[PDB]
């Protein structure tokens, strides 16, 4: 019942968009449709083109285009969406439709948090719907003739909850006949932004060694691939507990963690959800991929894990050739619930 | 700031009568407008959000509409439990500003 409207600086070009967030359902993406309002008296034989561009910016400034789609809206050369038909009826004869199809396996709108050193433009993946009027596509795009609207490709939490994330490891030591066992689990696989994460830790210490600390952290993994392969680690939540497990003793505790942006504002490169202009966006949602594809995507891939690490007391005849850190990792999903 | 000029200051209607309460925003607050019901001596109760979406649990007789900077709360049927002061909030810009309320009586 409402649409977005942005006009050209001269007022001779207006692009209508029904929404600014287009949901990726892994299999397919929401089609970017719209209506552009032209005036042939101003155009005088020019053509109105609409462009959808997915770019990886740096704001160096290594700006590259990951997907470009261009459509000639005026003069006309897809079936009309009901919204497009209604917009044409509202506007008139000089309103012309455009429609884009975002191919799958493209990045979602992800902004990397800038460091305090630099105050430049945003770095990450963003989409843009640009409408301009020019005689040919080889001509440069003019500011007075063009309208740029930033759109976002988003993903929401899966409707069906996944299997409970569990991990368990075990260590054997030279002077202990029985092993040290660590079990960690989360109460659910899909978490929402701002909601707490409960980590159920079960430590069965049958060794002669005692664990000094249990460090539990939520870490964000950003897979950034433009020129190289690079996975970046960022602990978005931590809990250093002084809980000690005595030798030949067991321990069971539940830890609660909540990742949020207030205490993570000094971490450069931290992935955030796509911004429209400069507003506060929460930590980046987990990107949903195909079940098994083993496919690498040009862009930023965000995933989260909970690392439960035991700090075992040092010493012994064997020495430093043993595990001082017995850790497990619990992959979970941090997303937004589907609206309504 | 933004002023939410709510009219009328108070209206009277019978049971089953149609009541329309109008809100005007000084600036363009988009659809970010909420409507509240506050009976005397109690806390306000959310009725509408986004200027048209009925809050969960609210009876269907409450409807919200927008026309540019003009927002309207309409009560299709006026049951006896619908006599309260109705408030209009915009939450598009800090500070959040409310309407002056509209007392509805017999």
């Amino acid at each position: 019942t409402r649409v977005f409207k942005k006009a050209s600086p001269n007022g001779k070009l207006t692009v209508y968009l029904g929404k600014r967030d287009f949901v990726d359902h892994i299999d397919l993406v929401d089609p970017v449709d719209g209506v552009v309002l032209v005036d042939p008296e101003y155009l005088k034989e020019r053509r109105v083109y609409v462009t959808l561009t997915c770019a990886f910016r740096y704001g160096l400034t290594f700006r590259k285009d990951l997907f470009v789609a261009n459509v000639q809206s005026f003069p006309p050369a897809k079936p009309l969406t009901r919204l497009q038909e209604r917009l044409i009826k509202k506007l008139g004869e000089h309103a012309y439709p455009f429609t884009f199809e975002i191919p799958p396996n493209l990045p979602c709108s992800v902004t990397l948090q800038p460091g305090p050193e630099d105050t430049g433009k945003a770095c990450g993946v963003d989409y843009e719907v640009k409408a301009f009027c020019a005689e040919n596509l080889e001509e440069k795009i003019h500011k007075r003739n063009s309208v740029r609207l930033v759109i976002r490709k988003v993903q929401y939490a899966p409707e069906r909850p996944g299997p409970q994330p569990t991990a368990e490891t075990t260590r054997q030591f030279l002077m202990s006949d029985k092993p040290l066992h660590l079990e960690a689990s989360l109460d659910k696989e899909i978490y929402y932004h701002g909601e707490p994460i409960s980590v159920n830790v079960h430590v069965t210490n049958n060794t002669n060694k005692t664990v000094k600390k249990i460090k539990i952290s939520v870490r964000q993994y950003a897979d950034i691939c433009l020129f190289n392969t690079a996975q970046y680690k960022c602990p978005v939540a931590m809990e250093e507990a002084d809980d000690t497990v005595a030798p030949s003793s067991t321990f069971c505790k539940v830890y609660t963690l909540t990742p949020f942006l207030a205490n993570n504002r000094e971490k450069r490169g931290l992935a955030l959800d796509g911004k429209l202009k400069h507003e506060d966006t929460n930590l980046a949602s987990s990107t949903l991929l195909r079940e098994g594809a083993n496919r690498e995507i040009l862009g930023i891939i965000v995933s989260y894990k909970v690392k439960v690490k035991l700090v075992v007391s040092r010493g012994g005849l064997l020495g430093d050739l043993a595990s001082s850190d017995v850790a497990v990792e619990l992959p979970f999903t941090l997303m937004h619930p589907k609206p309504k | 700031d933004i002023q939410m000029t709510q009219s009328p200051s108070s209206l009277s209607a019978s049971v089953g009568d149609r009541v329309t309460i109008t809100c005007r925003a000084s600036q363009s607050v988009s659809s970010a407008v909420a409507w509240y019901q506050q009976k005397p001596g109690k806390a306000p109760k959310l009725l509408i959000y986004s200027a048209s979406s009925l809050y969960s649990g609210v009876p269907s007789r409450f409807s919200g509409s927008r026309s540019g900077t003009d927002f309207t709360l309409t009560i299709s049927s006026l049951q006896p439990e619908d006599f309260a002061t109705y408030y209009c909030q915009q939450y598009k810009y800090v500070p959040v500003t409310f309407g002056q309320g509209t007392k509805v009586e017999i």
Partner: peptide, 12 residues
């Protein structure tokens, strides 16, 4: 003289 920012309009 500023750049026309994004607004909305009723689709009727």
């Amino acid at each position: 003289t500023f750049t026309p920012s994004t607004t909305d309009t009723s689709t009727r």
